[PDB]
C-alpha cells in the first residue's frame, strides 16, 4: 500500500509499506505475534473490534465499515448522518442491531402491547407523531417543539 | 363553557386498575342482570339511555357526559384472559407456599440477571433461571466454602411444574407425582405476599402494577357509551349462581363448574 | 524453544500491567515502564531462563494527584503466580494476602486458568475488589491502539457536577459494559463515569461521556 | 429499518441530541453543534508543506530585517521594525499556529486537508477585496494589534452553547477548536497584509461577517 | 421549572421552526378579522402582514423553549433575534 | 397511489412541519372535551360548577383536555379491561 506519511523536511511523502490481507479472523490471537504493529492492526469485524479494544473503538470501526459501503459506489454523505447512527447503535454500550427488530400507538394495535404496557407500569413520554394524533395533538418534534403564548408586558 | 385549566397530554402512565381503585371510582355497584324504568342497577346514573336526560350523575349530555363506570363485585376471583401466560411464569419464579423468589443475590448467574435494566429484558432472564428451581431452598453455597452454608428465609417446600390447562392452571409436585389444578384464590394469596423487592425485580411497579390485580376481584363496568353486550348480562348470571351455591354451602364440584362458568365469561368478554 | 518466545510474551505483559497500574494513577516511573527484555531477563532470572513468577508480584501506590481526585482509593498489589491452572488453595493465599494488608485492589495476572471454582473468592471480602487477567490479554496494551480513544475516569465530584449542567438522570449518560476491555483496563466500578476525549473530523476534539454499567 | 431506529432522534436546546426517552446521543450535534447545510470543504492551510513553506509564510520577527514586514504592506511597517512588545504578541500567534499544525496532523494522519467546515474564508475575502475595491499596490493601515487582537477577540465570539460553567465552557472551546484552526491560519498576520492587502475596513467587515455566518450555522433546536 | 430572565443559557436567535410557527399563528389570527398591528401598504395577504409585524418588531408572543429535563425558558418575539 | 403514508410522514418529520402533520394525519372525530384527575389521571371526573374526581378525594386539581372521540373510546375500552392509562399534563 502506499502510505502518506510527514518526511523530515514536512511535506507528506508516499512511503510505501507490505501490508498482510487476511481471509478469516482472530484479532486477539494475531495481535499478539511479534514483528507487527499491535497499534494499527484492523479488521472489518466491528464486532471483535469491540470485543478486543472495546466499544469506543468498536463504535470507530463501525463507522469506517459504513462509511466505505457509501464510499464504495462513488457517493459521499455528511459525517453527522453515519456519525449519529453509529452513536445509536453504540449508545448502551454493546453494538445494538438496527434493522433488527423491533408507545402505544398504534396500527395493530395488537391489545397484547397494552397488556404488557399495563403490567410494566410503561410510561409513554408522548413525543411520537403517532400517539400525538391519536390524541389530536401537535407532536413536540420541530415546529412544535415549543409552545406558544399571549406576551403580557408588550407596549 | 368549562371552569377547568386547557391543557394537552405530555404523558401517559399505564398500569393496572386495583380492585380498591375500581371500587373507589364507580357511580353504582352493580349486580342484577336487567335493563320499567329503567334501570336497575344497571344501567344507573351510569348512565343516560338518551336524550333528555341528564343522569344524575354529573349532569349533561349524552354527547356531553362522558360516560362513567360501575362495578361488579366477583363471587370469586377470576384470572384476566390477557395475564394467565405472566401469571404462569410468575408462579414459575416465586415459590408457590411462601411467596419467596426462588433464586436471589446468592446465585452466581441470579446477580447477573437481576442488573438487566430494561424490566422486560430481565424478567425473561429471571423466569429462564427459575423456571429450573423446584425448592423454595432454606439454605445456599455463597462463596466460599461450600463448607460454610448461608442461609435465606423460605422454607422448604417443593415447587411444581405448571400446566396451561386452556383457563386453569395445574400443578405438579415431588422430589411420584401429585396433580392438582391451582385455583385463583391460591394464586391469590401468593401473589399478596410477594415483597415490593421481589416483585419489582420481576418487573412490576408498587403504584401502577402490582402483580396481584392481574387476577380480577372486581370487573370495571363500562357505561352506554363503549356498548351502544349483554356479555356482562351473561357474566352477571354467572356470577348469581356461583354466590347462589356457596350461601347452599353445595359440594365442590359444584362451585368448581360454576366458578369456571364465571372465569369462562370475565374471559371471553375480553 | 523457545521458551524465549514466553520470556517475551512475560515481559511484554509485565510491561502492560505497569502502563495499566499506572494510567490507573499509581506511582510507576516511565523508565520502570521500559524496562529491557535483557533487565528483565536478569532482574527475574533463575537459570535455565524460565519465569519465575512470584518474583514478579509487586506493590503499587496512588499518587499525589491520585489522592488530589480520589482521596480514598488506597494501594494496590498486583501478583503474578506461577502455575498455569489455579485452584482453590493457591487462590487463598493471594486472597488473604490482600486482606491482611488493607490493600484495595489486587489484580491476579494468570496464566491458563482459574478454576470456576475458584473464581468465587473473588467478590468475597468488601470493599478491597480483586480482578483478573490472563496474561494473553495482557501481552498487548489495547489502549494504545490508533482506535481506542483516551478515557478518563471522573471523580464523584466531576460526576455530580457533569450530571448537573448536563442536568441528566444517570440513566441517560451513553453506557459502557463493567467487562469492556477499556473498563476493565481502568478497573471501573458500576457508576462510575468516563470522559472519553476523542478527535474528530468535524471539531478536532469532542468530549462524550460513559457510566459503567 | 433506519428511519425506525433513528426516527425520534432530535436536536434540543441546549444543543444535545437524545431520543424520546431523553437520552444523550451526542452531547452536541455533529461534534461540532452545526446543520449540515451550512458546510463546506475548505482547506486547512496549516497543514500541508515542508516547514521551510509553513515557516515562511506565516512568521513575522520584526526583530529581524529579513523575516519582518515589508514598509510597503503596512503603513506603521517602519514604526514596527525592533518593536519587542508587539513581537511578543507575534510570538504568541506563530506559536499558536505551530500548535495547531502539530495537532491537525494528529487529526488527519495522512495530511488531508481539505474538510467540511462552516463559514467560506475564502469568500468572505474574495468579497472585501471587490466591495472596497482593494489597491493592491499599496500599504494597508492595519496596525498589528488589530489583526492579532481582532482575531482573538472574534474566537471569542463563535458561539455554539452558551452556559456559564467550567463544562460548557469546555464544551463550547471544543466545539469550535477544527473551525479556529482554520480561522487563525486564514487570518495570520502576514497571510492578511501581504497575500490579502485588507484595510483596517475590510478587515472589521470580514470579522464580523465571519462571525454572522457562523452563527447562521448553528443547527435549530427542534432538527428532527 | 422555570429559569430567571437572566440565566438563559439557550439561543438569543429565533429558530426557523419559532419563526414558522409564528408566522403562521399570527396569519390565521389576521386571517380571521383580529386586529392588526402596522400599516399595510398594500398588504392583503395575512401571511404577508404577519411578517410585516415580525419585521417591525410588533408581535406580542412569547415562545416557551422546553429543555430535555422539563425546565422552560421564555422568551419574546420581540426579543429574539431574526437572521435566517 | 395518491397517499400519505410511512415514507410521507417521515419526510415532513424531517422538515419538522408538525401542525401539517397534526392536520393530515388527524380527522373530523372532532375535540371532545373530557375532564381528568390531576392525581390518578383518568376521566373519572364527575363535572352548576360542578366539579369532584372521588377519589383522589380531589377537587381543586383538575384539567381539561380535547381529544379525538375515538380517543376517549379506546381509553374507556382499555379501562373496562382493567388497565389504567393514565393522563398527565406533566412530566414525572
Ligand atoms: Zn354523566
Ligand atoms: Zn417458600
Ligand atoms: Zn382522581
Known amino acids: 500500500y502506499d502510505r502518506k506519511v510527514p518526511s523530515p523536511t514536512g511535506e507528506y511523502v508516499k512511503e510505501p509499506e507490505w501490508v498482510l490481507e487476511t481471509d478469516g479472523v482472530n484479532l486477539s490471537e494475531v495481535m499478539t505475534v511479534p514483528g507487527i504493529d499491535p497499534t494499527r492492526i484492523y479488521t472489518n469485524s466491528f464486532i471483535d473490534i469491540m470485543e478486543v479494544l472495546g466499544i469506543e473503538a468498536g463504535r470507530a470501526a463501525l463507522y469506517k465499515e459504513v462509511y466505505n459501503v457509501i464510499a464504495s459506489d462513488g457517493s459521499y454523505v455528511n459525517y453527522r448522518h453515519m456519525a449519529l447512527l453509529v452513536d445509536v447503535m453504540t449508545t448502551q454500550g454493546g453494538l445494538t442491531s438496527v434493522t433488527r427488530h423491533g408507545m402505544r400507538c398504534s396500527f395493530e394495535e395488537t391489545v397484547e402491547i397494552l397488556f404488557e404496557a399495563g403490567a410494566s407500569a410503561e410510561l409513554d413520554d408522548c413525543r411520537g407523531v403517532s400517539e400525538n394524533v391519536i390524541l389530536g395533538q401537535m407532536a413536540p418534534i420541530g415546529t412544535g417543539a415549543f409552545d406558544v403564548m399571549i406576551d403580557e408586558e408588550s407596549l | 363553557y368549562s371552569s377547568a385549566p386547557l391543557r394537552t397530554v405530555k404523558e401517559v402512565q399505564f398500569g393496572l386498575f386495583s380492585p380498591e381503585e375500581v371500587r373507589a371510582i364507580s357511580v353504582a355497584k352493580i349486580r342484577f342482570p336487567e335493563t320499567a324504568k329503567i334501570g336497575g342497577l344497571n344501567d344507573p346514573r351510569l348512565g343516560s339511555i338518551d336524550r333528555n336526560l341528564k343522569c344524575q350523575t354529573c349532569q349533561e349530555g349524552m354527547n356531553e357526559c362522558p360516560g362513567h363506570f360501575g362495578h361488579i363485585d366477583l363471587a370469586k376471583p377470576v384470572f384476566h384472559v390477557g395475564f394467565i401466560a405472566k401469571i404462569k411464569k410468575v408462579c414459575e419464579c416465586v415459590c408457590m407456599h411462601c411467596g419467596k423468589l426462588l433464586l436471589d443475590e446468592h446465585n452466581e448467574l441470579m446477580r447477573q440477571a437481576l442488573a438487566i435494566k430494561d424490566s422486560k429484558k430481565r424478567f425473561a432472564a429471571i423466569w429462564t433461571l427459575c423456571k429450573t428451581k423446584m425448592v423454595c431452598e432454606t439454605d445456599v453455597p455463597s462463596e466460599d466454602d461450600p463448607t460454610q452454608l448461608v442461609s435465606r428465609g423460605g422454607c422448604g417446600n417443593t415447587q411444581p411444574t405448571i400446566r396451561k390447562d386452556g383457563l ?13 389444578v391451582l385455583s385463583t384464590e391460591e394464586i391469590l394469596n401468593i401473589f399478596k405476599h410477594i415483597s415490593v423487592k421481589d ?9 401502577f402494577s402490582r402483580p396481584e390485580w392481574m387476577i380480577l376481584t372486581c370487573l370495571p363496568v363500562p357505561p352506554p357509551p363503549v356498548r351502544p353486550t349483554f356479555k356482562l348480562a351473561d357474566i352477571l348470571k354467572a356470577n348469581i349462581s356461583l354466590e347462589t351455591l356457596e350461601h347452599n354451602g353445595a359440594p365442590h364440584h359444584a362451585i368448581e363448574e360454576a366458578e369456571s362458568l364465571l372465569q369462562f365469561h370475565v374471559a371471553t368478554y375480553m | 524453544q523457545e521458551n524465549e518466545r514466553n520470556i517475551s510474551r512475560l515481559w511484554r505483559a509485565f510491561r502492560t500491567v505497569k502502563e495499566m497500574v499506572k494510567d490507573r494513577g499509581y506511582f510507576i516511573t516511565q523508565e520502570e515502564v521500559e524496562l529491557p527484555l535483557e533487565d528483565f531477563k536478569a532482574k527475574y532470572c533463575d537459570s535455565m531462563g524460565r519465569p519465575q513468577r512470584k518474583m514478579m508480584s509487586f506493590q503499587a501506590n496512588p499518587t499525589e494527584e491520585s489522592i488530589s481526585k480520589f482521596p480514598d482509593m488506597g494501594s494496590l498489589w498486583v501478583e503474578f503466580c506461577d502455575e498455569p491452572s489455579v485452584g482453590v488453595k493457591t487462590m487463598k493465599t493471594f486472597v488473604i494476602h490482600i486482606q491482611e494488608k488493607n490493600f484495595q485492589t489486587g489484580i491476579f495476572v494468570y496464566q491458563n486458568n482459574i478454576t470456576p471454582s475458584a473464581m468465587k473468592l473473588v467478590p468475597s471480602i ?6 483478573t487477567f490472563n496474561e494473553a490479554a495482557l501481552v498487548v496494551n489495547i489502549t494504545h491502539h490508533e482506535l481506542v480513544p483516551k478515557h478518563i475516569r471522573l471523580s464523584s465530584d466531576e460526576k455530580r457536577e457533569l450530571l448537573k449542567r448536563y442536568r441528566l438522570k444517570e440513566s441517560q449518560l451513553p453506557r459502557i459494559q463493567r467487562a469492556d476491555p477499556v473498563a476493565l483496563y481502568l478497573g471501573l466500578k458500576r457508576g462510575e463515569v468516563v470522559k472519553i476525549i476523542r478527535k474528530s473530523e468535524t471539531s478536532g476534539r469532542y468530549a462524550s461521556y460513559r457510566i459503567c454499567m | 429499518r433506519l428511519v425506525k431506529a433513528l426516527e425520534d432522534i ?19 450535534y455533529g461534534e461540532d453543534g452545526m446543520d449540515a447545510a451550512h458546510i463546506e470543504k475548505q482547506s486547512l492551510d496549516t497543514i500541508g508543506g515542508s516547514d521551510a513553506a509553513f515557516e515562511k509564510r506565516y512568521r513575522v520577527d520584526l526583530l529581524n530585517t529579513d523575516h519582518t514586514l515589508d514598509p510597503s504592506l503596512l503603513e506603521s511597517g517602519s514604526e514596527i521594525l525592533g518593536d519587542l512588545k508587539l513581537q511578543v504578541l507575534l510570538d504568541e500567534e506563530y ?5 495547531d499544525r502539530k495537532f491537525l496532523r494528529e487529526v488527519f494522519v495522512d495530511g488531508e486537508a481539505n474538510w467540511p467546515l462552516p463559514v467560506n474564508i475564502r469568500r468572505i475575502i474574495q468579497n472585501a477585496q471587490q466591495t472596497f475595491h482593494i489597491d493592491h499596490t499599496k500599504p494597508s493601515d492595519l496596525t498589528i494589534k488589530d489583526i492579532v487582537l481582532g482575531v ?3 474566537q471569542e465570539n463563535l458561539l455554539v452553547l452558551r452556559g456559564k460553567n467550567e463544562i460548557i465552557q469546555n464544551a463550547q472551546r471544543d466545539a469550535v477548536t477544527l473551525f479556529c484552526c482554520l480561522l487563525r491560519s486564514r487570518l495570520a498576520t502576514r497571510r492578511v497584509l501581504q497575500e490579502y492587502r485588507l484595510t483596517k475596513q475590510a478587515f472589521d467587515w470580514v470579522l464580523s461577517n465571519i462571525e454572522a455566518q457562523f452563527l447562521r450555522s448553528v443547527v435549530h433546536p427542534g432538527e428532527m | 421549572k422555570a429559569i430567571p430572565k437572566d440565566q438563559r443559557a439557550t439561543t438569543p436567535y429565533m429558530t426557523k421552526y419559532e419563526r414558522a410557527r409564528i408566522l403562521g399563528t399570527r396569519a390565521l389570527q389576521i386571517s380571521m378579522n383580529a386586529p392588526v398591528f402596522v400599516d399595510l401598504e398594500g398588504e392583503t395577504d395575512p401571511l404577508r402582514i404577519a411578517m410585516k409585524e415580525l419585521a417591525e418588531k410588533k408581535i406580542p408572543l412569547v415562545i416557551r423553549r422546553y429543555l430535555p429535563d422539563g425546565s422552560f425558558e421564555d422568551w419574546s418575539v420581540e426579543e429574539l433575534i431574526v437572521d435566517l | 397511489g395518491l397517499r400519505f403514508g410511512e415514507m410521507e410522514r417521515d419526510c415532513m418529520i424531517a422538515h419538522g412541519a408538525a401542525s401539517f402533520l397534526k392536520e393530515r394525519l388527524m380527522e373530523a372525530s372532532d375535540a371532545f372535551r373530557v375532564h381528568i384527575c390531576g392525581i390518578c389521571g383518568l376521566m373519572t371526573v364527575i363535572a352548576h360548577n360542578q366539579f369532584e374526581c372521588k377519589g383522589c378525594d380531589n377537587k381543586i386539581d383538575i384539567y381539561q383536555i380535547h381529544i379525538p372521540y375515538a380517543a376517549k373510546l379506546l381509553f ?5 379491561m382493567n388497565i389504567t392509562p393514565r393522563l398527565y399534563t406533566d412530566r414525572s
Open chain 2, 168 to 180: 386453569k392452571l395445574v400443578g405438579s409436585w415431588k422430589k411420584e407425582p401429585e396433580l392438582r
Open chain 2, 199 to 207: 416483585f419489582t425485580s420481576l418487573g412490576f411497579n408498587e403504584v
Open chain 3, 126 to 131: 468488601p470493599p478491597a475488589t480483586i480482578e
Open chain 4, 10 to 28: 432530535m436536536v434540543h436546546y441546549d444543543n444535545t441530541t437524545r431520543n424520546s426517552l431523553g437520552n444523550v446521543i451526542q452531547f452536541i
Open chain 4, 95 to 99: 506559536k499558536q499556529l505551530v500548535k
Open chain 4, 152 to 154: 482573538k477577540d472574534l
Open chain 6, 76 to 80: 374507556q375500552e382499555l379501562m373496562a
